[PDB]
Amino acid sequence: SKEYHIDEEVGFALPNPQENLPDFYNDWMFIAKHLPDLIESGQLRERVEKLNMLSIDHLTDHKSQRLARLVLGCITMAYVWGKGHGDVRKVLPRNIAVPYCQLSKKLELPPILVYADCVLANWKKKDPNKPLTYENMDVLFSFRDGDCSKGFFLVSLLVEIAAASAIKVIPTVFKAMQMQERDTLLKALLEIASCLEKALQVFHQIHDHVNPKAFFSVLRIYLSGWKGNPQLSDGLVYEGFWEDPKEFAGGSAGQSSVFQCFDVLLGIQQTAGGGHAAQFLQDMRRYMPPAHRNFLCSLESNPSVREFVLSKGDAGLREAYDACVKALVSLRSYHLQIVTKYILIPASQGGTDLMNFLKTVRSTTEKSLLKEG
Ligand code: HEM
Ligand SMILES: [C-]#N
C-alpha cells in the first residue's frame, strides 16, 4: 500500500495524534478542553459567540489540521445541540463557521464532526512505551461528564485497529492472484479471517465501558447531524460561508473504511442497487478522508477475489474465503445485539428503519457465502 495514509500498526486511524495546537489557537482549545463544563454551566454558547475569527493559515501540517478539525468539530456540536435537551441553535457563528469550513474544504471533508475526527484522531496513549490497550489509552475530547464518549470512541478505535491487521495483507492477496500462487492466496485469506475474528473479541469491551442510558440519552445526542433531522429541518447555516443552510450527516462508525474495505475486497456488493442501505453506505464515503476513499476505490478496480476463488474447484480456497465472509456477518450480527441493547431498549423507556438497514447490510454479507447451498 502506498501513501493511502494507512499505518501498518494502526490502519485507518491517525498514528500518534497531535494533542496541542499553536498558541495562536488557545481560544479554541480552551473551549474544547472544557466543553463538559462550559456546556453544563451554560456559558458555552456565549463563549463561542465571543470568539474572534482566527485564521487557519497557522495550521501547517496534516496532524495539526486534523486536531483543529476535531476541536472545531466538537465545539460545533456542543454549540448546535447545547445541553442537548431540545434547545438547538440553527445558525453557526461566522467567527467559528468560517475557519471550520475553510479547514474542511482544505481537508476535503464536510464541516461537521466526522468519525475520522472523534475516533480516528481523538486518542492518545497514556504510556508511550506500552501497548495500545484500553487501559493505556484516553480520548482527547468529550462532550459531557459521564457521556461515555471514552468508552465509545476508544472501543471503536480498538476495533478499527484490530481490523487494521488484515489491511496489510490485501496486497499479498492480489499479488498471489496474478502470480497464480495458490498456497499464498489461501494463507492470506485465513490470516484476514483471523484478524476479523479477533476484532469481534475486541468488540466485547463495549459493554464494559458504555452504559446504555448515558449513551442513548447523551452521547447519541451530540453525535447527531443535520440531514433529514426534524429539529433542524433545512440544515444548519454556516454564517459567512454559505448562503443557505446545508445538510450533513452526524458522526457514525458507519463512516469506517474498515468494514467497507473488506466488503469490497471480498466482492460483497453493499454499494450496489438503488436501495436505501446502498445509498447510505455510498454516501458515507464522502465523510471519509480523501486518501481513504481513494483506497476504497483503488480496491474496486482490482480483479475479483471472489470470482477467482470460484473459478478454481479448490475447497481449501472457498473455505478460506468463506472464513472472511463468515467473520463479517459475525461482527454485524454482534453489532445488532449491541444496537438492541444500546438503542432499542433505551428508546423503549419508526426506529425500526434502523434495524432493517443493519439487517439488510448483514443479509447482503451472508448472501455472499459460497458453500452455503
Ligand atoms: C454503543 C454501541 C454502538 C451503537 C449503539 C451503534 C449503533 C449504530 C447504528 C444505529 C448504526 C446505523 C446507521 C447510523 O445511524 O449511523 C450503526 C452502523 C454501523 N456501526 Fe455501529 N454502533 C455501536 C458500536 C459500533 C462499534 C464499536 C463499531 C466498530 C467499529 C461499529 C461499526 C458500525 C458500522 C461499520 C456501521 C455501518 C453499517 C455496516 O457496515 O454494517 N459500531 N451503528
Ligand atoms: C456505529 N456507530
Side-chain angles (χ1 to χ4, degrees):
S1 297
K2 300 179 83 294
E3 67 7 283
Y4 283 116
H5 290 45
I6 292 186
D7 179 278
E8 194 160 313
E9 92 151 317
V10 130
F12 288 112
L14 190 67
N16 178 88
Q18 194 165 314
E19 302 179 49
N20 308 297
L21 286 179
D23 269 43
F24 183 75
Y25 300 104
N26 280 179
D27 281 348
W28 289 357
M29 200 56 53
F30 173 71
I31 302 175
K33 284 289 179 181
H34 299 81
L35 235 38
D37 253 8
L38 299 183
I39 291 172
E40 203 205 310
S41 77
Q43 30 183 351
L44 173 72
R45 280 167 176 177
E46 170 227 307
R47 267 230 163 48
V48 171
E49 306 166 321
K50 251 83 261 283
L51 276 172
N52 280 241
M53 180 176 100
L54 273 51
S55 192
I56 63 178
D57 302 314
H58 308 290
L59 293 166
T60 50
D61 48 292
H62 188 65
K63 287 194 173 170
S64 74
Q65 286 160 47
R66 290 289 290 283
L67 211 198
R69 276 250 332 167
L70 178 40
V71 168
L72 300 180
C74 285
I75 293 180
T76 299
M77 295 308 243
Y79 188 82
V80 165
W81 306 125
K83 292 180 183 178
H85 292 312
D87 185 309
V88 39
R89 287 308 167 78
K90 293 179 184 271
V91 179
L92 189 67
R94 94 203 309 133
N95 284 289
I96 212 291
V98 166
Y100 191 32
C101 295
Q102 303 176 320
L103 177 60
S104 288
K105 188 195 170 192
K106 194 174 175 182
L107 288 180
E108 296 192 64
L109 293 160
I112 184 173
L113 195 65
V114 115
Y115 182 76
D117 296 314
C118 57
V119 176
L120 302 191
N122 186 37
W123 64 286
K124 71 169 204 176
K125 218 165 186 177
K126 290 172 177 174
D127 193 326
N129 301 296
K130 287 196 184 180
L132 278 174
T133 169
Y134 190 70
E135 295 54 41
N136 181 46
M137 301 171 81
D138 217 306
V139 305
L140 304 180
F141 302 106
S142 302
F143 291 114
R144 310 280 251 75
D145 295 304
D147 61 5
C148 288
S149 56
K150 176 177 180 181
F152 189 60
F153 292 148
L154 288 190
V155 165
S156 289
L157 210 213
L158 294 176
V159 156
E160 188 80 24
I161 290 183
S165 305
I167 300 295
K168 64 190 178 200
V169 337
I170 300 297
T172 311
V173 175
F174 293 122
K175 193 97 289 181
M177 282 171 63
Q178 66 152 41
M179 295 292 52
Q180 221 69 64
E181 287 291 312
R182 181 275 186 181
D183 298 326
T184 292
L185 207 211
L186 179 67
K187 188 183 182 181
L189 288 187
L190 299 169
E191 179 46 27
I192 287 177
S194 186
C195 294
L196 296 179
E197 300 169 328
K198 296 181 184 179
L200 177 53
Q201 229 52 213
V202 170
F203 218 125
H204 286 37
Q205 303 185 64
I206 205 286
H207 293 289
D208 302 326
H209 313 301
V210 184
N211 149 263
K213 185 180 177 177
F215 173 81
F216 179 77
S217 56
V218 185
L219 224 200
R220 171 169 143 288
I221 297 307
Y222 291 101
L223 289 179
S224 290
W226 29 96
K227 180 172 183 300
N229 192 311
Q231 53 194 209
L232 270 172
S233 15
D234 302 310
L236 173 82
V237 51
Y238 297 72
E239 178 177 51
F241 200 86
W242 280 307
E243 53 323 69
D244 305 299
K246 299 302 170 196
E247 285 184 300
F248 290 112
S252 170
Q255 299 166 307
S256 180
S257 300
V258 159
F259 287 44
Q260 295 228 42
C261 125
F262 287 112
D263 284 324
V264 169
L265 186 274
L266 302 173
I268 304 180
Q269 332 250 271
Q270 300 288 23
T271 292
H276 169 278
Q279 288 178 60
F280 177 68
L281 290 176
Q282 179 67 47
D283 191 47
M284 292 301 93
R285 297 189 175 179
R286 279 184 52 245
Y287 298 73
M288 309 184 169
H292 292 170
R293 65 174 84 83
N294 290 339
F295 178 69
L296 282 192
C297 114
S298 125
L299 278 185
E300 295 196 294
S301 75
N302 275 307
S304 179
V305 178
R306 185 157 196 288
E307 294 316 296
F308 181 43
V309 168
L310 275 179
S311 70
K312 303 288 171 291
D314 185 328
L317 284 180
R318 291 196 296 279
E319 282 162 37
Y321 171 87
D322 277 1
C324 297
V325 172
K326 235 265 285 178
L328 275 183
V329 330
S330 280
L331 275 168
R332 295 194 154 111
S333 293
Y334 191 75
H335 185 260
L336 282 171
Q337 292 170 44
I338 285 200
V339 179
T340 289
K341 174 180 176 181
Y342 288 75
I343 289 186
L344 296 193
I345 293 188
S348 71
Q349 40 179 46
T352 293
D353 300 350
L354 181 47
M355 289 301 90
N356 288 326
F357 161 71
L358 294 177
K359 290 179 182 173
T360 292
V361 170
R362 167 169 130 204
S363 171
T364 294
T365 308
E366 247 187 297
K367 275 176 171 58
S368 292
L369 280 173
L370 302 182
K371 297 289 77 189
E372 204 288 319

